[PDB]
Amino acid sequence: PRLICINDYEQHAKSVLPKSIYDYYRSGANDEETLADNIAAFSRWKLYPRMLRNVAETDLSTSVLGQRVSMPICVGATAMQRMAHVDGELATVRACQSLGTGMMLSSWATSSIEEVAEAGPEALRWLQLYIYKDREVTKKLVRQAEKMGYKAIFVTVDTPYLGNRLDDVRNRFKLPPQLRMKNFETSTLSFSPEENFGDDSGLAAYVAKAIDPSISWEDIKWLRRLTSLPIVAKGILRGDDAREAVKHGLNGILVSNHGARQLDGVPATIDVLPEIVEAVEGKVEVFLDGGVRKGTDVLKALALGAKAVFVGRPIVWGLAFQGEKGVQDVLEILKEEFRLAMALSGCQNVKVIDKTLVRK
Amino acid sequence: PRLICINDYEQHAKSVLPKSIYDYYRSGANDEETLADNIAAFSRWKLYPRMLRNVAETDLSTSVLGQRVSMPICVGATAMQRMAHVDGELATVRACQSLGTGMMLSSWATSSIEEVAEAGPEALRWLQLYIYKDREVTKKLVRQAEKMGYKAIFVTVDTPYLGNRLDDVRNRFKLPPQLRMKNFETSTLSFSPEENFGDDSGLAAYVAKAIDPSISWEDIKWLRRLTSLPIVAKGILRGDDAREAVKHGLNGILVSNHGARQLDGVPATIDVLPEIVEAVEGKVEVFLDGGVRKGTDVLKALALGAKAVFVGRPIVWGLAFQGEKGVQDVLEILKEEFRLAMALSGCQNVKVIDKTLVRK
Amino acid sequence: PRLICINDYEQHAKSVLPKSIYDYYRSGANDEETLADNIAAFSRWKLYPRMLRNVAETDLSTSVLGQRVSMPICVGATAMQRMAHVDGELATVRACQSLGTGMMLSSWATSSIEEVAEAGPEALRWLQLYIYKDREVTKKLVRQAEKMGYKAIFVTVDTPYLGNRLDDVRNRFKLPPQLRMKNFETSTLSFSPEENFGDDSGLAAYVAKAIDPSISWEDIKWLRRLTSLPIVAKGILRGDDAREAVKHGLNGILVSNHGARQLDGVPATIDVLPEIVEAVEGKVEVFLDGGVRKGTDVLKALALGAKAVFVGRPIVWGLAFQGEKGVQDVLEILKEEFRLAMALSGCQNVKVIDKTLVRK
Amino acid sequence: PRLICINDYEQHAKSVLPKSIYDYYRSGANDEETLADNIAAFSRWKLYPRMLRNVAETDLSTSVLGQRVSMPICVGATAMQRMAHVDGELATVRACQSLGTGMMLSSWATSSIEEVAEAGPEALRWLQLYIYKDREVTKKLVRQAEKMGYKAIFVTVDTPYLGNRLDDVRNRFKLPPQLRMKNFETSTLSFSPEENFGDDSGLAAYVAKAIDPSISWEDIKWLRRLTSLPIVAKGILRGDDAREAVKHGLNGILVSNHGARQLDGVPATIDVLPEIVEAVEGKVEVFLDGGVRKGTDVLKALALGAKAVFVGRPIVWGLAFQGEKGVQDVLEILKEEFRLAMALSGCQNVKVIDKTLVRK
Ligand SMILES: Cc1cc2nc3c(=O)[nH]c(=O)nc-3n(C[C@H](O)[C@H](O)[C@H](O)COP(=O)(O)O)c2cc1C
Ligand SMILES: Cc1cc2nc3c(=O)[nH]c(=O)nc-3n(C[C@H](O)[C@H](O)[C@H](O)COP(=O)(O)O)c2cc1C
Ligand SMILES: Cc1cc2nc3c(=O)[nH]c(=O)nc-3n(C[C@H](O)[C@H](O)[C@H](O)COP(=O)(O)O)c2cc1C
Ligand SMILES: Cc1cc2nc3c(=O)[nH]c(=O)nc-3n(C[C@H](O)[C@H](O)[C@H](O)COP(=O)(O)O)c2cc1C
Fold this sequence. Notes:
- Four copies of one chain form a homotetramer.
- By secondary structure, chain A is an alpha/beta fold.
- Chain A has a single domain (1-360), classed as Aldolase class I (TIM Barrel).
- Chain A has 13 helices and twelve strands.
- Chain A has helices at residues 6-16, 19-26, 33-44, 88-99, 113-119, 135-147, 166-171, 202-210, 217-226, 239-247, 269-280, 295-303, 313-344, and strands at 46-47, 62-64, 67-69, 73-75, 103-105, 125-129, 153-156, 231-236, 252-255, 285-289, 309-311, 358-359.
- In chain A, the strands form three sheets. Chain A has an eight-stranded parallel beta sheet.
- The longest helix of chain A has 32 residues, at 313-344.
- Chain A is globular.
- One flavin mononucleotide binds at residues 25, 38, 76-79, 106, 108, 128, 156, 234, 256, 258-259, 261, 289-292, 311-313, 316 of chain C.
């Protein structure tokens, strides 16, 4: 089928993925108020384009944490990508390498840190880290990322417990039989579908067993001493927490509500972005994810002070359509929509995308 | 059937309850504008969670009027519970005893004050009082509550006449043949379905015959002299009335619109809560009911200054599913959702649930 | 069928009236934005009831222009009532006489001024006047009203031309064959369905032929000199026009958008009421019509400073159900809903219905 | 079929036009947020009519850039009108001549500048100009307009690239075989459907090949030196760009979002109109297009300071119904709705249509 925008990809994915996998990928937490809002909020921000600016030569390039990227549109961590396509994370990293953009690799990937570095050696790669109760497991992940040429750690800070995703509970979500979380060396930590993970969501049970709910700023201190790699706090929604991340010597904030999958009824990320940008006082790069579907979404986040955005679900739908090629298609669609959004708004490059371009 | 959230319970209840009983339980007044709003309003209050607070050990316990409870989630008065399940109020009090939370017993219960105290002797129990034209009836109810170890009187002040519930009028609502309001000793006062209660809603006719529309602050004065038990004004919606309750030596306010069943077009209780908390100046505990369905609802009410919330309809749907076990399930679902909402918002206990957690 | 609220009456009317008649009665102008808003706006005004006020003895009585009425709910002018029921205006006035409220009689009634006075001699009656190009016709109507014991003139000021009601155009609306506008003595002025009234709405053509689009404040001056009866300006939507009516020695303002049938996209009458009440500075009574369907609508208009409200369409639906008895039913439903709305809001009588009862 | 308002015309058009042509005509850009808003925004602006102003003799006449018109309602440029009806632009100009209003002729017309001047010699005619990469092509268009008695140039400034219209991409939109853009003398520039215009929207490819994305204020300078005809900047959405147009010696601004077909998520034109009128300080006439469907839309734009409005899509639907006669019908409907909107709001002529008539 001919798919020409991101929404087309989701629709096709629903038609070809088994229910429990589609549901895992699509779902938000509880009543999914924030899931709807992540998208609605973008529509409330209106664009005020400048005309007659000469946009013959639009340059989409930028940098994330000192590393050059082809566009301010990067791949966010989405667990267990092999459920969507046999090649999962390997397909994803290859598409990123082709595009000249970065991939943030989930700690719960169905491919190892090493496997991913092998498949995309020239690709900009970062590790998304969950703090395990077992700090040696956690340390190993970080050390492996450093060894394998990953350029930053995105530490997820909004997941002391898993959000309650109703469909996952109903479907008793678990990995397909042939698949594992490939970063780990035990049946429990690798999320083996042959393992006892209770009678509800397998993933919620996995988090409860493996992930540390006691995670504090002290643990951020530990992490900051552990690695000299740039560290981004992922999942911040408040200006005071943002300032705290900066105080702790962190190098960035990813304004995120975990794609509306954690606490439901939190605001849309585009709505909190300005408070966070203001709080940080230019001291650290601020990124956004959550509900990015169109070039104009990217334009709005940048106008509001974000350095770059990350996409979660669109990538998984790309994979579901055609693995590597599907992901490349999705990224190219976003790139082209962004170029056009830039051109029609009078922006020659990302440096001239200013706050007067948007109003709520 | 597998029911995993409060809404699931309502759906099942509709499938197993006779129409007139389901309709009695579900209905609001007139066009049901406030009924919709009680729920919608919660969604408008957005959460601003703190991260990295150490939430390994979440403590949900609190106190209501000096009595310890396991969670700030209590059972509100809902008349005639035996329509939902053979055990009605007895099932309810047993579930409350198991949970370590309180039950507010309707004056229009299908089980006596004594029957309920016998079924849940260790349970925290309060009496919801309606002021009868017959003050000796009223006095008896209060004296019985004191004798039978009930810890407070919730005096309902928003029901000089019954609200107009359209479905009840259509169905000519009345008790099933085998059931009575068991606190009373005459055919009229016990709401006998064999009695003449007009051609419209039997309950509206019952109120008109039995309940005193002349109820004033003088009657509050009488009540305050009658018992030394704590007294909570239930059904207050204005700050000036709140201050008046405090002046009268009352010990609490339950901010309530009677589950949107009285005057339609009043605001949602979550929306008026702040005005009431402000009016009371910390002098008396303020509670809320109306539209509480999810853990995040409980979190929002507490963030806005409520000591605890009460649930009406969810309890009746629990009963409809499986009597005592159904009620326990509903309460446990609310408890768990609340725990998770607390954890994900960075709250170790109820004392740290502050106003910065919410914004309208 | 059992009909228990105003909406029930409209539904039944649609089932028993011929399409073109139902459509004439239901329609607003153009896209009907104001028609929807007249109702929606009432829902936006929220009620803040007082408790414990002693409402055993609710007194609904008031006065309109110095004449006592049983409730602040009166019958507004609706043309051609015999289309709805054989007895039309005669049924209506008889119901008003029974209720102890007033009837405002349309200049385009299917019953004469004299016929109506004969059918309801003791009923409070007012004449709604349209200014005809023929001033002798106009004068005759006024003189007849005076002779026949009518107590005021409601001069309609928002109809220099007829609003564009799309359904009427489609149906080529005209009177049924057996009926006339009975105040007039020629084929044209009596709106004979045997007459040439073009190929679009017969009523729009009738207005263009008969009604004076040149109507100015000078004509108000003429009217004010013509009769010593109280005169109310009906159809005012602006405070400046309100002040002008007062300057001209008029005795009242009916805040009206002609039931949303004239200019579409004007605000709801409940929304403009406050500006008008403020403009008038207590110098003249202010009334409202447009979208009144429920007792709480009446309560809100009074809280916002209206002396009384008028109902248009509900009366016609009463007629469609059962002529006189149907109208009486509709009025009694409104009366009872209003009583209950008063009682539940802590109002013993209309004098204590204050502005703190509502907030937008 | 009997069609009595603009919406009726669209509905009929959908029933008789081939899908790809209807879709081309109907579509907005991307998710069509602005397309919906262009219409919704008009409904948010509420009217505050004056009564008793004497509206017997309503005069709709005005002037655009010093040229008298019969009404402040003119025909906006819509490309390729022969797809809608065999006579296309020739039918349109004949209808405009009959109405005494102006036609703005698209540079992408399916009829030549000369053909159109021949068919409507007495009609007020303007040329809508796109700046071609080939400036000699561009110059020729301007010189032809001057020669053929066109009275102004509307330079479109919001189209450095074509907006992304999803349906056009899906349908692979192209001209029907028998048709060309008749102003041009090569296969590419005339948009020959036999030409290679890629695998997506033929029109997007045509723009990319033919239209200059480098267009700047320098090009406006060039245009202003090229012709002494009045020049209007079409597609301005910001006050700062408006001031820049004035500085450049331009004679007008058409506040336009290109009928929501360019950048999606820009505000409705009625919403930005006031900022633009304020920015211009009376120095230049300001016009509006986008979502004009009803007489009250025209009234609102004038109340907010627009000199006249242009209609795009309604004209094409007129054509689809009955070519010249269809266009005349559409224009006459708009004229009559506007007259009535004027009369009912107390406006004798366009000079008295003031800002107090509207409020958002
Ligand atoms: C299927 C799915 C799996 C996810 N897994 C992870 C994960 O493993 N680690 C993590 O930090 N965030 C995870 N997230 C959250 C994303 O990193 C990101 O914040 C979110 O997808 C952004 O919203 P979007 O999906 O609307 O683009 C996941 C999100 C989805 C939708
Ligand atoms: C079926 C039902 C019966 C009720 N009966 C009583 C009652 O007997 N006494 C009383 O004070 N309130 C009564 N109420 C109001 C409740 O105490 C409470 O305010 C309401 O149920 C809270 O809203 P919720 O149902 O959305 O949780 C009743 C409510 C319902 C839904
Ligand atoms: C069927 C119908 C006929 C009407 N005829 C008249 C009329 O003859 N004279 C007049 O001044 N207003 C007329 N009106 C307007 C009413 O007096 C009144 O303003 C309107 O009905 C109030 O809104 P409501 O119908 O929502 O109650 C008419 C309204 C309707 C609905
Ligand atoms: C089918 C169609 C074709 C259009 N072609 C042109 C064009 O050739 N040149 C131009 O400047 N604007 C073009 N526009 C934009 C219009 O001039 C105008 O801004 C728009 O139609 C106004 O919105 P409306 O269609 O809601 O009336 C086109 C619009 C439509 C709907």
